[PDB]
Amino acid sequence: AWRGPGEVGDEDKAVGCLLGAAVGNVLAAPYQGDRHFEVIRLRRNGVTDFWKYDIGAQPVQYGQYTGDFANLLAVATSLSASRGVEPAHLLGALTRAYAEGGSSVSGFLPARRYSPYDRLVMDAVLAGTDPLKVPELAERYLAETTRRHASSSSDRPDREPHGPSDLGAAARAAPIGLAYRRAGGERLLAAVRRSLEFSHPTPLGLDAAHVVAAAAAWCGRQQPGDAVGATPAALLSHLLNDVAVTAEQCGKLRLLRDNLFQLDEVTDWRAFYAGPQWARLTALFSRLSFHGLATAGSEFASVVLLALLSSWGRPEQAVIVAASLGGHAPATAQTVGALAGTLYGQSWVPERWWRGLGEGVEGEAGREAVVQAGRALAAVELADGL
């Protein structure tokens, strides 16, 4: 329940933080939009290996991550370059990791899967719109989608509340949290507010990213040893007492605290998926997310914390659970792996995931570039704001 290396160096912690997000996004890539009961029947042996036969809208190739991890990698590289958060360079790196190829039909047809709000924001900031007037072009539909929701209550992804209260704010805040880990909490909050100044300016998205980044910071500080620092209840209490201000975020985190059983070590995933532990986990996940889709920032952060803390001490089990939870599976598994990497260094990633990352289309150079981004994230200094 403490992994193994009770003391982990900062280099290992940051390379694990990058690589856990990498393996989560690659592992849970073909399960975006699917529900948990569909996923556990598609993969009856468990989501333990990278899938090679995605048949969806944009078939993700073997070993390929999506636009969520692309944005996380761009955030990490820009933050390592700027020694902090500078929105201009952050958007420069985000667009450099976005305009990597496609077909200008001009929606540009991005190479990796992207969230609709993320694609809209990047297209707006590439279309000359200044990255501070969010509602000028980000209220395309959205408000009209709320006006169109007046006679339908669908769980269809086209009616998911994608906007300034999305999960993309909190999906890429883990590098910010790990960099601002020892620089205090208020400066981390200011850094997060600087990071989401162009896409997610709502208090809900701010609180979601704040919870995620603060958890990342905390995880970076504590080490996988004695339960004084290794305690999910202590992490939840710290987040509730210092970070959680909004009502829905607070309520979801208390709903986590009240519940949150600890998952046993799982070997037969086919037997686990038909078990009372997975039944209770799915019941809590359905209480914390609407129909398996945690599009809202609070629901997404609560789901990420549920998948991370319900399997405390087994980060691989955490990543597999977050991949098999469905819904926004690649972003959820990326955030769970990023938190598990801020906790434990590069020793829990299995050799199957290492070889799958290396042998994919985004492999070899891509895997070592993720490792180098982790190295730069460990090596970057900020001196409490720079």
Add this chain to the structure above:
Amino acid sequence: ALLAYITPDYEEIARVSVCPLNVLTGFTLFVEDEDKNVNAILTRSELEGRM
């Protein structure tokens, strides 16, 4: 209406009316997703949720 709302991956509710046309029953307008399961596909989850 409540048990069609709380059932995941079900046809979503457009309207719910009590005694339409002075008819001694209610009526829930259910909207299907043709692009999801064309006009040929039924799964056991859909059938059990319908039951």
Add this chain to the structure above:
Amino acid sequence: AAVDKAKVLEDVRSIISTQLGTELEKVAPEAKFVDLGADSLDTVEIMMALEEKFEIALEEEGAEKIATVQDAADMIAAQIAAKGN
């Protein structure tokens, strides 16, 4: 006659607010007209506006006992139900 009491209450609140000066928020169901500070004659003018907006005849006997916005909407909705006969 199955009157949509929610719609009736919303339009009643809108009329009350429009006449007096308050926003739609301040006009709450349980709020008394006295709280809003409509005088006696002003309450009468509000009843006249409600009659003009809903195109119905207000139940005279009982207009001295219209205290809440909920009571005004309930009497109005009962009159909308009784109009069709």
Add this chain to the structure above:
Amino acid sequence: NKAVDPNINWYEVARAMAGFTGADVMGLMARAARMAARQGRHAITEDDIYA
């Protein structure tokens, strides 16, 4: 051509009309005008079409 309310999300309505031809749509707008008359309006709303 006729008189309808402009604040109608014709996509959501057409989603509710999954499996229809075009003359079916035409006749549904005609009877939607009939329901508008029943509710007491000259313009057609999405509520009138659902009714």
Add this chain to the structure above:
Amino acid sequence: ELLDAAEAKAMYGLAINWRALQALTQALLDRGTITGKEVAHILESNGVIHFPDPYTTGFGWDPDGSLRYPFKPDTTPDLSGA
């Protein structure tokens, strides 16, 4: 047995969402007709509980007569005068 499983799951859902069911009943009584958004708003404002699965697997009725999956398992006549 399939009908019994479906009936057990339906009664389980209506029992765990009793308050939301009563509020929706009162709203239907007051308004006559109602839309999808108002249904969603009423059910979410009354604290509804969603089904984790759309399957009736494990639901049913016990031989004594009690429900199944109710958190209990998991995955002489008077002969006086006249």
Add this chain to the structure above:
Amino acid sequence: TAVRSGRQQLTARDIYAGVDRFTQGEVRPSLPTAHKLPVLCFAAKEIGIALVAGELRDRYGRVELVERVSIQPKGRAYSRTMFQRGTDEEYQLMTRGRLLDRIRLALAGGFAVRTALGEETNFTAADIKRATRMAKKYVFYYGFSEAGGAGITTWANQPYSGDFVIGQQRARKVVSTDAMDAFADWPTVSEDFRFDAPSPSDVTWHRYTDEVRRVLKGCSEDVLGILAERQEAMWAGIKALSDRKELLGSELRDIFDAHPAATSRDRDARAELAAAKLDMTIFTEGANSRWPYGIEWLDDAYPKPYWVQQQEAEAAEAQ
């Protein structure tokens, strides 16, 4: 089609499109890319049918090769699997192994959809409807089963002629599995010489339908074992079908050869081969084949037939 393709008349795809334009007329719009359900179902059924056809071409060799799988809707259908029709004189006679292979090929599409989705669908309904009729022809008319110990039942439904159809809907051309069905069957045509036999009783009908269920269970378990052992090849074929829409039987054979079985699955992957057997009930399996036949109410309804008493007295209690 070759002219519109901007090249000369190379490859067989333009020829197959020209054949399809008049055998399965018109071209419907393709399956939607929104949601992963229909592209998966109407690729998994045809991939599984082609895979089972290849596996039965191995070992036995009776099943003809697969020409192509389409999954682009061209008239009255959403997906197809074309079979390279073997020479005639192979269809002029229905063999027991050929009928077993046909039953397996019928069940293959529905069980492949079930194996892909991890869930039963309505795709098994048409396959079950075809396979039950084929199994009834297997057991009763042709007498290929072991019903009664030699396969000769006391009743068989001989097919009638088409001259009693009257309506005779003019589909024309194409000629599907009718070429294997009506060629081996010899219909009645003469009502003066039609034999129908007395209709069997409920008990012997129970035994005969149990034999039909046994045949269906065996074929279904074989199909499920094949599809459980070739999951990787089935998934690769599904991905290729979703990527390229139309696909030829040649390229399917290359894909299935490129993804062979993983020898012995040993564990975990062995749990797919395990519990792929059906739990369906065969009533007259072991000791339930003398008179009660696993029926607790039969002795409360039928008063112990004479040959039953002979079986229980001459054979039993006298050995």
